[PDB]
Amino acid sequence: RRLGVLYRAVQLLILLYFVWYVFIVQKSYQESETGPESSIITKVKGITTSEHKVWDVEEYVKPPEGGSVFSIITRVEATHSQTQGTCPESIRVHNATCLSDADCVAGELDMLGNGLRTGRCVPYYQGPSKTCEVFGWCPVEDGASVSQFLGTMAPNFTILIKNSIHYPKFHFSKGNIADRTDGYLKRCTFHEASDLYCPIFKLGFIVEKAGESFTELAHKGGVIGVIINWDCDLDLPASECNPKYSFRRLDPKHVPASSGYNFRFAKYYKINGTTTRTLIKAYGIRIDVIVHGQAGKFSLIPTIINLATALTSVGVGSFLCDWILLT
Amino acid sequence: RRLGVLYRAVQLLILLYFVWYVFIVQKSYQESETGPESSIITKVKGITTSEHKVWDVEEYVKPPEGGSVFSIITRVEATHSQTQGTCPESIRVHNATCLSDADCVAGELDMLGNGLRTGRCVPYYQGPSKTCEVFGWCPVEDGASVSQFLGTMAPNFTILIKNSIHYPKFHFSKGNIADRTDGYLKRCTFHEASDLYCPIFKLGFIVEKAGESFTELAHKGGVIGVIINWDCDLDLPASECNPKYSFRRLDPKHVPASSGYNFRFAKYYKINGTTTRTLIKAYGIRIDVIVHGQAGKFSLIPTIINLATALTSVGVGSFLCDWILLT
Amino acid sequence: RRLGVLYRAVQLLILLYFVWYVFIVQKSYQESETGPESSIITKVKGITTSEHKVWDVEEYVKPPEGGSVFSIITRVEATHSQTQGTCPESIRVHNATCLSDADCVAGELDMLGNGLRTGRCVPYYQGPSKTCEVFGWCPVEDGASVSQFLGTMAPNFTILIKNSIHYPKFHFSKGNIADRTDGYLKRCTFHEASDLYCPIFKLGFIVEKAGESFTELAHKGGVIGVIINWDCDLDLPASECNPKYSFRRLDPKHVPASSGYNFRFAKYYKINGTTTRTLIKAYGIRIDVIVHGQAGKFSLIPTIINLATALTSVGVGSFLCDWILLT
Ligand SMILES: *[C@@H]1O[C@H](CO)[C@@H](O)[C@H](O)[C@H]1NC(C)=O
Ligand SMILES: *[C@@H]1O[C@H](CO)[C@@H](O)[C@H](O)[C@H]1NC(C)=O
Ligand SMILES: *[C@@H]1O[C@H](CO)[C@@H](O)[C@H](O)[C@H]1NC(C)=O
Ligand SMILES: *[C@@H]1O[C@H](CO)[C@@H](O)[C@H](O)[C@H]1NC(C)=O
Ligand SMILES: *[C@@H]1O[C@H](CO)[C@@H](O)[C@H](O)[C@H]1NC(C)=O
Ligand SMILES: *[C@@H]1O[C@H](CO)[C@@H](O)[C@H](O)[C@H]1NC(C)=O
């Protein structure tokens, strides 16, 4: 009687749970593939100015080739006319300060120093201190570097990411630009809803979507990641598989020591037969384009496994009801 | 009687379906791992010529280091003796054409322009038009660039990809060159059957296997991906795990706007104390080596799950036959 | 009687096997995700010396930007004052040796040669042999290169890897540096137990943990991979997810032909209006930072599938016991 009503209510509850959670919500009827094959072609385009200098893309984008990882230099500390010679050590180098020649040890190369110590105390670049003389690339950066801010109009720089994926097991291939001939990429601006196949992003848009302040991320540097997630359901048509662009800062923005991004490169010249160089310490924003994939397609093996599990679970509910009735 | 024959025929049909499709075909008795750890070492080697110039690998391969992504330059547009100064704007820049000084706005920096506008109309490099004067790197590329075709013998360039994978969960590690001392790599040519452990590919072979035409992909540029798939069955010996090299074009070859690959780099010089440069716009073929993995090894958990599913399915066939007989 | 004891012993054996192997050992109650999103920021810092030259990071680290793949140059073969002209071919080029002008074919460009053959026999750089004259970058490397060993103090170079992962499906994100303000990274040394969030590694430590000898890996070059495995169990707190750094050599160290790492880059100058260059062949150790992920979190679907399998298996044991008793 009523025992039958409760007995069948348990079965319906178990079947509901399976049909909803296991199948509709979690798609246990589906087999999944992750890690597609991606191709990223980037192209930064924009020009900026300094006190009397004009910087083009060749100057502030390293490396020049358009790939997943590139750095947009927003500030430089250039040390011009560096030659191999003898000069005072940087005041920031461990026990570089000296009062006499006895305080400097000859032939001492510090790995964090700027050269091999000559062994005699020399006046610093700006008085009145005295630092141990070193042989290396001179003058040192910490004594003869001039800072230039490039990124006054870095926010208006535009980056064009060209992505294309492929899912081998499911034979799915797609890109992030629509095959058109209407002059679209020459006048479009990215919008996650209106214009999703115009992957031309301003640097300022990327930074603000990452939650970052451009001045702080430009003076000290930073790393911002442009993440493309192709969470794809292959039972739906190919027009239902779209790229989702997320922006987030990838460097340890909270650790004071490791926050920032910078690197050194030099420009090499022969002046009167002697090799001179211009050491440039570049602070800038590195853009990493990370592509992530998660596909899904209906597979019969998972479906039958879960159906068998549902039947066994309904049987276990049967056993539980009978056991409660007996006791 | 005959009901028994049909009843057991249903069981045999269900068991066949499982034993064939679930186990033999799909290998549901197996656990899978994807995404191994890969190491790619590339080395392009070949020399080409121009009207009176000889180009070596250092000149047309960027970046010089041998990694997954590199570009082989097939054509350049070099603008020599570029200095920071004032010169006419490119005729391709928005509203650069002027008839008088009033048509040029002083201090206007266009992000797609080639400098900061001085504010006075100047004659173009070739008459009779007049363009707004700009301050930047001068002369501009669109007025003083000379094109040189490098890739006359690019098809005979040879790329040596050195790959090595590792599957952590299954403790499988392999490479794409056989440990030999017979002078093999100095005289071998790749063949997907005869010579699969001689990964020395001519650029023309890669292009033709990608279905591309070398002249069009060399003048305008392109991106070709060398895909290595280690679809591996670990129940078989290690000699049964082999690399499969596939070649396909990765750029949007159909979109007119985004088809092609190019980038700019410059050579910097000091001439009479003033920084001059040679801006080179390089059109070439980028080679991406993409390594994809899918391993499989027999695991007891999937086997028992599928066996339980088979037994439950045979029981469901039993129930269906009995239900048909009753009704 | 005793049949009951054996009958229930079989059930307990099957249940033990499941509860131990399927659940406790293999964690079949868990769903897994692999392939997180990684960000790698490297920074090599150290200075070395030669006979009379001091080398800084800008000189021996290529590329300058701090990413996953970079090369630390330990030895160079620099060919200075290379200009486009005519010079003897390298004695190592196929049939380059000549006895008279008839042995040289005019206009012959060998892809493995160093230029276009002029067609007349010229004396070699060192006597008494004679090689076919070529037009290219002259003098050739095999005749005018000078070797300098940089890596006397390469083992004391320190590399700072900055990693940060993210698991999308499980919403887990972590890095490899602890958020601190105690001046930790300026004085810490990595230890896999004591100091795991100080990812500052000496090059010598990386090499010795890889099992390599620094002198051989420095003269000839090599590739060493720094592997970070985030094998993560998400049922445990976030303090229980840690990076595991493994070091191994990635190049074919056993194949004599393919063992080693080297590349060429040049320094370009204008001398009296003619383009000269310094071709540098760099032998060094390439560091690849490979990040691998394997997360796990309790999921109800696998748990119920395995519980149903356990019940079915106990039933199959029931059937086997009854069948043995009947026969
Ligand atoms: C630095 O030099 C001073 C004076 O020569 C010496 O007392 C001190 O120990 C040195 N510090 C080192 C070597 O770390
Ligand atoms: C450049 O970007 C800034 C902020 O990102 C914006 O205020 C400014 O209007 C932009 N420039 C132009 C010409 O729109
Ligand atoms: C270009 O300049 C012309 C004349 O100064 C002006 O009419 C036009 O609006 C300008 N186009 C712009 C600013 O996009
Ligand atoms: C170079 O390649 C082209 C086509 O790829 C071929 O026709 C030619 O014979 C090759 N050169 C040599 C010397 O074999
Ligand atoms: C090299 O040159 C010699 C003499 O000209 C010739 O006999 C030989 O066949 C050549 N080898 C080649 C072209 O591989
Ligand atoms: C540099 O490293 C070597 C071995 O890696 C070691 O013997 C030497 O002591 C180190 N240098 C210093 C100053 O500790």
Numbering used by the authors:
A (entry chain B), B (entry chain C), C (entry chain A): 39 to 365
Pull verbatim passages from the article behind this deposition.
The P2X2 receptor (P2X2R) is an adenosine triphosphate (ATP)-gated ion channel with few small-molecule modulators that exhibit poor pharmacological properties. It is known to be involved in the auditory system and has been proposed as a drug target for age- and noise-related hearing loss.
To investigate the subtype-specific features of P2X2Rs, we used cryo-EM to determine the structure of full-length wild-type hP2X2R in an unliganded conformation. With a constricted pore and an absence of ATP in the orthosteric binding site, this structure represents an apo closed state —a key conformation for defining unliganded pockets and understanding the molecular changes resulting from subsequent agonist binding. We refined this cryo-EM reconstruction to 2.7 Å, allowing detailed structural visualization of this P2XR subtype. In the apo state conformation, the three TM2 helices are arranged in a “teepee” conformation to form the closed pore. In the apo closed state, the three symmetry-related side chains of I343 form the primary constriction gate (0.6 Å radius). In addition, another constriction formed by the symmetry-related side chains of T350 comprises a second, more cytoplasmic gate (1.1 Å radius). The primary constriction gate in the apo closed state is only 3.7 Å deep into the plasma membrane, as measured from the start of TM2 (Cα of L338 to Cα of I343), and thus the TMD forms a teepee shape. In addition, the surface-accessible volume of the orthosteric binding pocket in the hP2X2R is ~2,700 ± 400 Å3 as calculated by the program Fpocket, similar to that of the hP2X4R (~2,700 ± 19 Å3) and the rP2X7R (~2,700 ± 35 Å3), but strikingly smaller than the binding pocket volumes of the hP2X1R (~3,300 ± 200 Å3) and the hP2X3R (~5,100 ± 20 Å3). In agreement with these predictions, we observed V60 at the extracellular end of TM1 interacting with I339 of the neighboring protomer, D273 on a β-turn in the lower body at an interface with the TMD, and G353 on TM2, directly next to one of the pore-lining residues V354. The simulations using our apo closed state structure reveal that the left flipper is a conformationally flexible region, with an average fluctuation of 2.78 ± 0.81 Å calculated as RMS fluctuation (RMSF) across the three chains and all replicates.
